[PDB]
Amino acid sequence: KINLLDLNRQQMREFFKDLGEKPFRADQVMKWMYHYCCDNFDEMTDINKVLRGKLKEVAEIRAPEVVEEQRSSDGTIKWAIAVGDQRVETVYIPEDDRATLCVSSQVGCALECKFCSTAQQGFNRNLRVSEIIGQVWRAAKIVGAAKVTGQRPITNVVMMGMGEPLLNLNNVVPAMEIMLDDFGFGLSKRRVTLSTSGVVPALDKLGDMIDVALAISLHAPNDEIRDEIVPINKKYNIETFLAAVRRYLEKSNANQGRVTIEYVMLDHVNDGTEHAHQLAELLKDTPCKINLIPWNPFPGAPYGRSSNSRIDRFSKVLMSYGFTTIVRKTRGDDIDAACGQLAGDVIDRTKRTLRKRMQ
Numbered sequence: 001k002i003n004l005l006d007l008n009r010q011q012m013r014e015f016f017k018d019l020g021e022k023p024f025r026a027d028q029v030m031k032w033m034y035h036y037c038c039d040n041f042d043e044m045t046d047i048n049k050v051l052r053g054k055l056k057e058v059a060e061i062r063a064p065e066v067v068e069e070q071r072s073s074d075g076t077i078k079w080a081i082a083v084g085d086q087r088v089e090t091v092y093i094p095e096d097d098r099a100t101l102c103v104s105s106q107v108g109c110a111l112e113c114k115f116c117s118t119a120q121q122g123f124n125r126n127l128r129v130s131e132i133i134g135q136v137w138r139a140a141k142i143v144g145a146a147k148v149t150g151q152r153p154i155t156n157v158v159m160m161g162m163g164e165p166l167l168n169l170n171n172v173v174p175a176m177e178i179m180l181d182d183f184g185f186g187l188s189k190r191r192v193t194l195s196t197s198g199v200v201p202a203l204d205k206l207g208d209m210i211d212v213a214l215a216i217s218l219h220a221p222n223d224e225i226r227d228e229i230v231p232i233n234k235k236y237n238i239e240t241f242l243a244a245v246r247r248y249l250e251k252s253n254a255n256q257g258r259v260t261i262e263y264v265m266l267d268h269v270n271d272g273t274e275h276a277h278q279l280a281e282l283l284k285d286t287p288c289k290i291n292l293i294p295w296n297p298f299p300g301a302p303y304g305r306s307s308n309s310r311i312d313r314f315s316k317v318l319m320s321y322g323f324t325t326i327v328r329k330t331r332g333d334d335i336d337a338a339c340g341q342l343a344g345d346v347i348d349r350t351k352r353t354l355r356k357r358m359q
């Protein structure tokens, strides 16, 4: 059966055309899928029985299942999500004015950022469209579908879970298209963010395919530091990355002219005032908003968390040059908030097989 969660609107329409149906019936089913979080054709009461029959035979709505759920006292929900025989992470971060979902792009990552827990697993495989948009679908279903509760469960999506999104463009783009779609999650392009450590030619490609808000994982003020911290910089250095960012801003207006810059704060590595002065000079040619992120520790990482006084002085230096800078709040502090940790060791895979036999 075809998983309808693999298809954007164009493809949904083409599939329904092959079923002998008019294109607007695809729109109607999408609306059921995403506005109501319906995965059951019998529940789609305004579709005729004949179409329901076709769909039950040749199609399905199969979203990844939750295998673990952690609920923070601050409202954050962290899910381990089953994708085949593997696990990825999806995180729901509520606020009064907002609700952000952090979504994974790959099982593991091949980029080897030393401060990232997902790096130490390595790269396993790319997620399919259904496995990416399906995280939004599952989260929406659990939190409460928009037309069920009368409130949009998710106002904001960030591709900031496990994996490098620019290395899964084939699947990440259609998934984001569904997020943007009126018949999908109806999100504004300003409210869908793709974060990247800087796969430069893939970023040039992204710009030709879709217009979404861009965030860059910079984490260093110069090349010698960034080579160490984020090793893809050895392939495409800061200047190459920043030039690509400028080219993207020419094609896209989701950022409203200003790229989001992510900067993780690693104790006595990239968090000094001397690093802040260098960063300020580095970014003089690129319009931006700077997010300083306290590093989230995990066992065996060769870094420490920067103290809040060191982070605050770093921020003051940046603000003295007139940069819009924001120190991000730690969310879900009472739970396993470090990216990649809840979908931990891949060796537990065999143990899961054995577990299911006893069930």
Ligand SMILES: C[S@@+](CC[C@H](N)C(=O)[O-])C[C@H]1O[C@@H](n2cnc3c(N)ncnc32)[C@H](O)[C@@H]1O
Pocket (backbone or CB within 6 Å): 115, 116, 117, 159, 160, 161, 162, 163, 164, 165, 195, 196, 197, 216, 217, 219, 262, 264, 293, 294, 295, 296, 297, 338, 339
């Ligand atoms: C997990 S990555 C996924 C998207 C893309 N690969 C990237 O690096 O931007 C999303 C963001 O999480 C950050 N990150 C990873 N591990 C972290 C940790 N332990 N503490 C704080 N931030 C972390 C990275 O710096 C990156 O900006």
Ligand code: SF4
Pocket (backbone or CB within 6 Å): 109, 110, 111, 112, 113, 116, 117, 118, 119, 161, 162, 163, 164, 197, 217
């Ligand atoms: S920070 Fe991003 S690019 Fe680096 S290893 Fe983690 S998921 Fe991959």
